[PDB]
Design a protein around this ligand. Structure first.
Ligand SMILES: Nc1nc2c(ncn2[C@@H]2O[C@H](COP(=O)(O)OP(=O)(O)O)[C@@H](O)[C@H]2O)c(=O)[nH]1
Ligand SMILES: [Mg+2]
Ligand SMILES: [Mg+2]
Ligand SMILES: [Mg+2]
Ligand SMILES: [Zn+2]
Lengths: 27, 201
């Protein structure tokens, strides 16, 4: 399942390691 | 899970984008700074007849004065508002540029065109000159950030487009900063009629 970035609130797909928008790493 | 959409707010520097987004008090108290991009994301909740919907509005930190915005700003936008200043004709002249920048990166997302500062007596960009929206599923609203005038209108149109429900309503206005200027009910009436008159041409 996808996940919400804690920094910019963008939704990333479950695969991504960092936010596709703000490059913030997944917690 | 909460229903929410990324909304990018673009337009020339000085058109009132920051002033506008900040009217929404809780969106301002809960805003998130994104250093990597130099952006503040304002979570704007609106309560609709079908539940809450949240617009996460991306506000620049002024960089738009010095060039086009980077891809990461636009990335994954689901809707947008394009703003200009009806007291600065060049800001409206730049609208097609923002649209192009936006569509290049986001495609055919719902977009609303806003002419801000209509509270100001000596208006320069009047209804009959505002034409860019007619062509591309772009809705237009006059607004006045400082007076809260038409504040909910862009958000309601986008809500109806995103949910796919023409009958969606806001059950109540969000708590907003008290107007710093007054929007003359007569000007609002004339500007409103001016847009309908124009829409039939
Ligand atoms: N009269 C009037 N002035 C406004 C309005 N919105 C913004 N301004 C002024 O325009 C200037 C630039 O506004 P700002 O929000 O910083 O624009 P931005 O660069 O697009 O983010 C500021 O001095 C604001 O006070 C409005 O609705 N009415
Ligand atoms: Mg600003
Ligand atoms: Mg506040
Ligand atoms: Mg509220
Ligand atoms: Zn992010």
């Amino acid at each position: 399942g996808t996940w919400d970035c804690d920094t910019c609130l963008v939704q990333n797909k479950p695969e991504a390691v960092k936010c596709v928008a703000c490059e913030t790493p997944k917690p | 899970p909460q229903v929410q959409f990324k909304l990018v707010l673009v337009g020339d520097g000085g058109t009132g984008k920051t002033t506008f987004v900040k009217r929404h008090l809780t969106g301002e108290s809960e805003k998130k700074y994104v250093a990597t991009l130099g952006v503040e994301v304002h979570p704007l909740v609106f309560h609709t007849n079908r539940g809450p919907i949240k617009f996460n509005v991306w506000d620049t930190a002024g960089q738009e004065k010095f060039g086009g915005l980077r891809d990461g700003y636009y990335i994954q936008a689901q809707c947008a508002i394009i703003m200009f200043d009806v007291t600065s004709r060049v800001t409206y002249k730049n609208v097609p540029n923002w649209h192009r920048d936006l569509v290049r990166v986001c495609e055919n997302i719902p977009i609303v065109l806003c002419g801000n500062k209509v509270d100001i007596k000596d208006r320069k960009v009047k209804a009959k000159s505002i034409v860019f929206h007619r062509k591309k599923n772009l809705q237009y609203y006059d607004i006045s950030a400082k007076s809260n005038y038409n504040f909910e209108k862009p958000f309601l149109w986008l809500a109806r487009k995103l949910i796919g429900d023409p009958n969606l309503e806001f059950v109540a206005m969000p708590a907003l900063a008290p107007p710093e200027v007054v929007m003359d009910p007569a000007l609002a009436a004339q500007y409103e009629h001016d847009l309908e008159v124009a829409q039939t041409t």
